[PDB]
């Protein structure tokens, strides 16, 4: 009886700037955008969410002493395979997969989660190659 969209979803493109916000508070909003929680036509099994582009990923910041205390782990399937780096080294070299690990942590787990991860595009600032899609600038709610 209620509406449930399928193959009629219109997906927009959004640009999110990460110059002054946390890792962090923006990542939950980006995950909610990718899920489609901002649209009234949300249906939980058809991925009504839309594309988002994040620029200035190197300008991200995070409060406290997390630059030296937050540790990322990438354990292999080999014994003694625990490899670790700090948040400063992960931000300094390539913070793109920092942001994608944040979004992947806040996205749901499943086939739709891997599908909604594909709409995310994180780039080192401040230009993106998606000008042909004509993305609009999105301002964060807070």
């Amino acid at each position: 009886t209620p509406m449930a969209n399928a193959s009629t979803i219109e997906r927009k493109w959004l640009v999110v700037d990460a110059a002054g916000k946390t890792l962090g508070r923006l990542s939950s909003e980006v995950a909610a955008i990718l899920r489609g929680k901002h649209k009234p036509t949300y249906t939980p099994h058809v991925d009504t969410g839309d594309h988002v582009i994040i620029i200035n990923a190197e300008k991200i910041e995070l409060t406290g002493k997390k630059l030296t205390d937050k540790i990322y782990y990438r354990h292999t399937q080999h014994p003694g395979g625990l490899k670790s780096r700090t948040a400063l080294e992960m931000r300094t070299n390539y913070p793109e997969k920092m942001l994608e690990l944040a979004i992947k942590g806040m996205l749901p787990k499943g086939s739709l989660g891997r599908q909604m991860f594909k709409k995310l595009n994180v780039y080192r600032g401040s230009e993106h190659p998606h000008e042909a899609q004509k993305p609009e600038v999105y301002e964060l709610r807070g």
Partner: protein, 117 residues
Amino acid sequence: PRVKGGTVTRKRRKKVLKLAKGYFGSKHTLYKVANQQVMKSGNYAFRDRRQKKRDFRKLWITRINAAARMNGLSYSRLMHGLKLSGIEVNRKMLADLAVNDLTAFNQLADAAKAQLN
């Protein structure tokens, strides 16, 4: 006298196997796993007939929250406004169909705006 009882057993087995049609592998073929799958499906059917009544409600709450946040209010403020701006008992999936029939939802949202201040 002697009772053989040959046909009613096979009638029961075929009723169970026809109830278990479409199942994977031997569960639509062998009786002794089909009966277990049918009983488990009965429990699952009762449980999910209970659960559909509330996950539909949470989907409608999500859609009303999205439509209200388009208009500057959260869900809780919108529902508090609907209980304050008269005793209107307008149910939530009719409120979700009201955004399929926009802008009727915006008028009720403005009615919520009017007496929250």
